[model samples]
Target chain A: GSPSVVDYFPSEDFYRCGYCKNESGSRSNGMWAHSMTVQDYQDLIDRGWRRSGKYVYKPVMNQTCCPQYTIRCRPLQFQPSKSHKKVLKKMLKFLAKGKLEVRLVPVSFEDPEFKSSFSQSFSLYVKYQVAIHQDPPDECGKTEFTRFLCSSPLEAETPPNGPDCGYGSFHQQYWLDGKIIAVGVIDILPNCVSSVYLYYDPDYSFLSLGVYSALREIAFTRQLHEKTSQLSYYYMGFYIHSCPKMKYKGQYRPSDLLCPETYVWVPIEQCLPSLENSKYCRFNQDPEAVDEDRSTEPDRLQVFHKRAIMPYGVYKKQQKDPSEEAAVLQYASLVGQKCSERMLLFRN
Target chain B: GSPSVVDYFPSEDFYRCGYCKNESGSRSNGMWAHSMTVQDYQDLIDRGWRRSGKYVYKPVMNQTCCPQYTIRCRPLQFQPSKSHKKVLKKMLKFLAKGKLEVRLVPVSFEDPEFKSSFSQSFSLYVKYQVAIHQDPPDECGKTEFTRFLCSSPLEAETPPNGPDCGYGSFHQQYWLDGKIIAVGVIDILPNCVSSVYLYYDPDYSFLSLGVYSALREIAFTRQLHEKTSQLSYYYMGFYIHSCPKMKYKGQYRPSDLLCPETYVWVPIEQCLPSLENSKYCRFNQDPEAVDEDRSTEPDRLQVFHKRAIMPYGVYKKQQKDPSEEAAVLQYASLVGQKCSERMLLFRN
Candidate 1:
């Protein structure tokens, strides 16, 4: 039998924002994906979860310092802005002079050079964070590096046609005159090319490697699209509107943001103003609508079952505990819409 | 919308066994799970896939140096043998003296003592492998140790009742008079307590810690079953019948092994003789049944679609490419029976 459901646990309710004092709280739903199918991740990502190694998490949109929305772009419909075109051309000029080359390598733990290569990349990661974000310089090392970026449970899939067919997590190595300058860590899945993380040599920052890597990834998605129509989208991770530094994620035109309340996809252009108005507004709801109390009663919630997700009411009935129905109803009211109606006894 | 289907790419043919010289090649169908639900993992594990952190893989049971079978025990039904009972009693006696204690901690990178604690465990792991397995002591380091034992993508879920209601990966620390001696790394999944990896202080090997740990894990599973019926089984990784060192996995009585061909569970007592006859035999098929060619034809396989798995016959019609039908037909003959009819054009 194919596993069709994923299990997740909500994290402790607390504030995790280092930038701002504890004015607003932040919470997340964490998942330890012991084993997850691609469909399971697709479903989770739709609900706003993102993964770093085995740590899968989604920010609590209704109660967070900054609301982060899942954002994606249809590669076929994507029209590069003038600046985007410039970035693409910048890489092309170097390629034309034989000064640059892009090579794709499937991620493998057995790769002999992986350790040294990753250590070098980690050095640059630390440098970037310290210089750009003003973070502590000696905070990261090999252990943190591997846990955050190099570690993945997903096995690498090689396309039947060849490497050009593109499958699984790959490192798009940007080599300038035979020296590694940047590496784009991307996952080529059935429906999209997801950008996990990217890092580069600080010396190459002048090349706008960050934006260039995005274009290269988009080009990779387009290339994969020719082989299969399913590979038509490029997921650019979360789009955080409140932070000006994070606004560049929205600059990728013709993108879509997943609505927090409805789980519907809304055009970035239409949702930007609402985001500007408030740090946390359910994009699908009226901008002027007041926030509703969405507090959960922990005791009323039913425990998750492996075979299926059972709501409190159904769980109580199954156990023949008539006294627990009141708590079950309270639990249903708090978070019924997030879980599908098929799994819940009381529909919202 | 929730993603109902997982995307997978099968791997290229190659033998991966290191135990014996590659006389008869062993191959595997590698799946890179970009996202997989617990249900999906349950399904995959039934078909023989095992995960290491983010890496999910299945051994080619039909063509390998040593056949690896998925093994599990029913915790409630498991009656401990005399030696098993002795190991449990030995630990209990130490506990009764107040000279030993076991504390459970959830796996997390945020723990302040994580780095130092893990480094000590890694050193012991290196020593154990060198002394027991006769492998190079210098082969493993912090990176390998963390990736193999500490790293997990699954979210820790503590039951509303408390830590006593276990439901996630936890490190069971065995302390002798307040000094840590052993760590049993285990995952409390939806239906089972899976032993990921366990290591301890080499000085404590005289206590038969390995066998004792398994007994403790089985006890842990039984403890969890009291809280929820779903957590009733114990998965002891792979059971390799040919290897004497690995035969201890089968010692846990009333255990079951997954049939390599049919994906059915069979009692370990009934399958020992067949394993003695050959290194690789389809447990469900007739012992006399000759091995057949199971090579894959990549072109005949259709690319995975997000909503459903499409076969080449239907995919050809949709794309209007008649030339591809021959390869599709050949592919159908080889693997159709293994995949469900809806996902495959032919049924085995």
Candidate 2:
């Protein structure tokens, strides 16, 4: 029902300087803020950099040189890894026979059962697992979990009518065997599943339950596919490529990233390597230092003619929609055949 | 320019309940979850709850009621409150003079100045603010701010004759008063301005610096609009209505929420009251609770319906794509519509 498209962009780039020659220095240049004014952007667009609308553009040359640079994945085509499969099996062991129960009955917060369950699960997370990646082992030794728990689930339920309730669904519960063991919660949006909170029996880490929960969500999505075509996506929170532990999110086959530029999905693996290699071609580390050194010594590296830069005036007249602004240059009839970034759903 | 359809769903009849009233007092009552097998869903759809090929219909009957009912303001259209205006004017005193600089560029982890500034800012936030709302003040006191401050900035430019660098052109900085106080970091995307992060001197909090940055983003977006009519939007970060402080996002005028169901922008204000009421209704805190109980009976409260009953089934189906499903029921659609406590975002 929906045309799948993945968006990708260079999270990092290379910078060549006249002050440092490829023969004389390493390409991993110094780091600099990629700041730009309207004028600077227009000049880039004129050099056969294809712009999607206005603010977004992909250099035809860059894509030609880095053919593998892309982000993509096929959801329907995805297959799980071993760990993912293990978690699913564990979850099924608990919920396999439980009928899909839908109820219109409302529970009261004052119910001792609700309070005990909520408290136990929340406290279990704080007590056993590392809530924050940086917490020390003994941090909670003498500390009561009270400090981290909210004043009341009542307070938590304060705004429970919006599409984004802090808790995902009202009937949400965690069951292990016949006993409810953990709580997996999230909001189901029209297109994607927004993960909320997960507090489980920490002792079940062998189940790789956290990872399994994510995979199970995909299964739930697939089951839901029969009821409605609206929800086919499982939005695993944000992807912080810089964090190694967080990188596990990429292990899921057919997952894509929301390109910061396009709010579109792009396969993650395709772009990782080129981003690694480009570090050597330019003073990839520090741009300001390289610029400072280059300004003082012109003959240190190969230099190209700096053309009359496109004026900000041109951009002001042409690029308008931010989405279009990013890709606006592509719309222009360029002098040469432009090679644009490949837009695909899940490219193998 | 996009036509701001602020009142698109003004007609009330469009939101009538499609399900037949189940008058039985048992679990399968009109208000309870039905035996909705896949076939039942098909049969129901054939009966008329089906509209637009995908929307599942729950009866929004004559007796349906709702939960929290509050309104939200469109921040973009908002005329600055006196305090907000005062803050903006004072901040402009620094920015208007063109004196800001970008000098505090740290070269390496070993850079003494870089280390100190990073540590200081991290300590400041860690000390002054709790990591999350649930955590206590002292609980987060020991949290490390080290990793957060080590983010590496991308560089500008590439080596001449080296494989073309994927880094797009971005090298312009605005300064005021020879101090680097404000920074605008954004990625030009295919259709809109994807604002990443905006940080300013906390000393300027009086100006509501966050809102100012958003305004500036829109200003920049407007400039793009003049050029191509494509880059007209400024993608503000996610909208989480559950957090009270985040409600400020709703202040933008003529704004629309991405219909998670349709990926369309539904007017923000239109959903406010319903969202508010849903929040109020979730805790059974509604003022009408007492009135209804007096008329209905305390024990039978579970049988009484209110407006905040979360349509989880409807919601789940629509999460994948709202347009393909029924145009997601707007928050306002719940007004005067009966809901059971069973339908709120969270279960009590």
Candidate 3:
């Protein structure tokens, strides 16, 4: 059987970061991807690999200037906070007119209409990136828009038993006056509807699309949750407690931030008190509870070599270098043994 | 060192084709690309692999309804035909005002302005496909435009000894009124400026931008020839002689058409007579003059296994299926020993 396509770049040096804007403030391992099963991606996100289109990267929690903790919300227990309620009520007031239309296109470019709808969303991305994010026009162009949000490695498969939209990428478009005003790009994975990005027409800043779309996305997860129990959690990508702008993400009460050292999802209530004292801290209080899966099975890690699925043990015998094993094992320990055994590490 | 990333998809059976409007008019192998060096892509085009977006496919010359012969012109020896001359004169007459500007963004997304400029080209593609090709608004979109023209797997690298533009992708934009009227998507490989696609505003269809762009592309190739002998040919993709719309491609005199069986470049003059009689022919008249590189060196074929590069012989021992050898070797012969050794065939 075919395996997930992944290529690892072990973190050996510091690199520039987006959040802190430090020239060499980031330390992370990178992975170039071709395609992956929904379940594999779910595993990756759990291991701290933030899926950035075709390029996935996992930050060194202790080393990076802005440490990102993977966070998720259980849709079943998610309650709109007082601020969230006000934002949603305001958004509800706008929709109360019944003029705004929600046109959702589930991710799976198997058809042309979906392709057209996604392209229209890019038009919104350009306007929002330039006006809101202050990205240069070059950064807002189709290439960046598509490369960041459109080029996905997660494969969308609809089995006989699966739901109609299946499990993969989904683009939710908010249309007004026959034009798209907001686009919520989300990944409908096996375990969650991960919030990839949500960009709106900058003119509608008063609409509070940021919180409004997030509220809507959580509600969206509930709809799919009815279809399958596997799709219940709502992943909001990374949450950096030290970043001022990112603080609002914590307001989504009952959320859990992943513990770097323990790889456990510790409640925000339990984690915040400790985070207030230090920029980075292990969410889990018990020092005895360390990350359980640092195991490396290099021999069993799948490798795509010679146009056939094989083991690293068999594939590495032909290589010229010997010390390469330590570097690869480093990647194995990061992605963990399960991922190492599944995703096809590109060998060329 | 890492090599080009390629995944082969053998043509197991007939598939639907864009041309001839047949349910199963095409039979060809496909290669999904993650990243490829320009030199590798050049060799691919020579072997008739039409690089469309990130997917490269070759036609089964005899099995398909339309046989596509990979065609290219020796730009150094090119002579514009009468029709080609007419196309240039008309385009020249329009540019006589000295208002039209030619801005070339040598294909490297390393910078921002180039990204902005390339996105402008996609807007033109939407207009051209909708108006001239009569495609639906959905078909002429940012996704289609970017996927077909912008999502390149070819790697662009510049060494101290190479041209400033290096050997990679190039986007030549024809601007008027500070707006892009046409975009010629060309690949600046080691041996040719492969014309991937060119589309113009239908309003400028009177200028015959199709043939006009082809002529300009050939000249563009000639300009690069001054820097390196390796960059002398102008590849015009597949020239399907059987399709009347493709008949004009034969007019690019002193060009060469790759023979399907012999893999030799036969003069278009020598190819046309035989093509008129039969869609398929072995251009090399001498039966002894057969394809010389059909040798399969499967053992040495590089494999990316478990995050390391290894030889196929070393990798296959771990695979469960034994019959896969025949399939892998078939691909080896098709791509040839050189490609098998050079390109990293994605296994798994």
Candidate 4:
């Protein structure tokens, strides 16, 4: 669904008569966000902004709320670690003076070459994912393969120009040197690039195509600005820090993630204290902390927000109701299996 | 003996014409550097522009062979490792409301309280350094400990008019409240702050004073612009990529290092490819490559250098020079034995 009322909130007590406390003007018309169907979202995308996650392909109407967010990193200021350096070195070795060129190619899942390349990359991914040793769900048989190759009937039926899908357009490109080595497909919106599917030739696994391709996408997005006449930000999926491998997204400097409510960029480092605390998700500025006496200066006071996912232990404690339910089930089973009664039931 | 032409090159090179490629420029300017006795070196330091090791400390000398070689890191861009995050979390547990305030102090080598604090912090550093499962030389055992204090005495001297230590000055700071929790002494130079000695109270190990203080130094350096005249950089010591602990310095963003010959910041990442290939060093700009380009741009043609320290194996090979004369001690045992036998025969 399109982001409509996601960040919209009204304080009746604070602005009872439509006069905002701060000089900033209020929404004179009383705004209400329109719910977006897959088509509506696609339309919004065509205008400017892009999405990050999988989108449903249907009409979602009469929306009361919409959420909009972005991920941003300061690329010019990035520094690499040993592991990152190793990845970069490997990439350079794989390229070995080969020309870094990009070719625009539309992906047809039915095409044999596409299938072969995708499957080969997928298999190699699974192989290393198993052999290299990652945590449980991210490894071999537990691969998120299905998500990478989703071309359902519902998707094909929704025409690209449909008003229902908003203004979304798909484009695919293969970054190659003579031979196709990597492939990426994305949906462009008004202001961001929503990554659809990306895969590479496993033979070129030495190059971290997964990461490099995302960078390419950013450049491609900027280029698209000239043709589409819309500013675009390269959306590199979710930025998860606890999961070590998942933290690579943060390596793309000049990228910022959208705050759940305010739709403001909470810089990753600024959000770090909460991650360290394992108690807050966002830092809220305290309005009361402003000292008007000394200097009516604006002071930014950062406090934690509640939605930040707590550590696993805290999560477990907070999920006590579910845990208690499980406990009840175990108790019931024990009672049902009482010595004499269990034997009678077995005999019957 | 003070570091001079005599201490560096053999007597032959000293006697040769000062027109040698490496010696020409500095000597031509009447800035002739000569070897001096220890007392003379000390006296020279009292004046300033002191030379120690490869780093020449000219607190007031505007003309330096290497000027743009300053350290930098983007604190906001850093992605803390799992262990780093853990340490930060643990340190926060000891802080008041998870806020940090900086304080300054001096090295109290004699105070028992300081010693106890130093020992505890040192122990914590050792543990955290190893926690990544990598072993480093014991801090106390390494010659760096002494060098870190005052090994070569390259630029050490009593303060003349300002703060003494002619080269630059530094201050120690405690981060949390007023616990004397962290000690950081830095050299305040014309355009940069050279980190002298930084250690924290290990009892607050979780706070990661080592990394935290480095960040603080950069911030302090930037702030120095307001206090003093010149804007300073934070000089992180040598970055040895192979050494895990030392490599963290490279993770700071927008940083460049001094290429061996020409003094300029070849961005650390840009200089990396050559560093990875060679045992010792390579020019950041390929001297030969530039010569071939035929471009007239001075900046483009200016060859930049980046060298890695020679590995122990390579050093061994270089030391085994057949042209060098054997020492008198090489045949001492044989000569002594022959003399003893002849003496016995004469007695018979």
The C-alpha lDDT values of all candidates are 0.61, 0.35, 0.75, 0.39
Error of 4 at B253 (Å): 83
lDDT of 1 by residue, B17-115 (tens): 555557456666543334334433444555566766545666667666677788989888888898888877776775676266777766654454554
Query: Model 1, residue A59: displacement in angstroms?
Result: 1.4
TM-score of chain B of 1: 0.73
Top candidate when judged by DockQ against the true structure: 3
Worst 10 residues of 1 chain B by lDDT: B339-348
How much native contact recovery, as a fraction, does model 3 achieve? Answer: 0.00
Instruction: Tell me, by lDDT, which candidate is best.
Output: 3
Q: Order of all candidates by lDDT, from best down to worst?
A: 3, 1, 4, 2
When 2 and 3 are scored with lDDT, the better candidate is: 3
| TM-score top scorer | 3
Write model 3 residue lDDT over A1-348, tens digit each, in one string.
235777676657677677798878878887777668888888878888787788788888888888888889988889888888888888878778556777767554435667677667877887887798786674354445545677677767666555667777777888786788988878877777677678898898997888888887788788778888777789888888777777778889888888887777888898888878788876657668866666546798877553345678888885546676776787787777788888777653
lDDT of 4 by residue, B1-348 (tens): 111221111111111111222331121011112212223332222222234322233221123221222344433333455655665566557564635667542333323444445544455435444553244543232222222332232223323332322332334546454345665555544445556446555455556677766655665555555554443345664454444555676666667665543334567778777656652364547564322212122221111011112222333343344432122112111113222111111000
Model 1 stretches astray by more than 4 angstroms: A1-7, A18-25, A94-98, A111-116, A155-167, A285-348, B1-348
Q: What is candidate 2's lDDT per residue for B207-289, written digit by digit as tens? A: 46577766666665565455444334555544446554556666666665533212234466555565654532221323343
Lowest-lDDT window of 10 residues in candidate 4 chain A? A339-348
Residue B279 lDDT, candidate 2, scale 0-100: 32
True contacts kept of 4: 0.00
Docking class of 3: incorrect
Per-prediction TM-score to the true structure, in the order listed: 0.45, 0.27, 0.56, 0.28
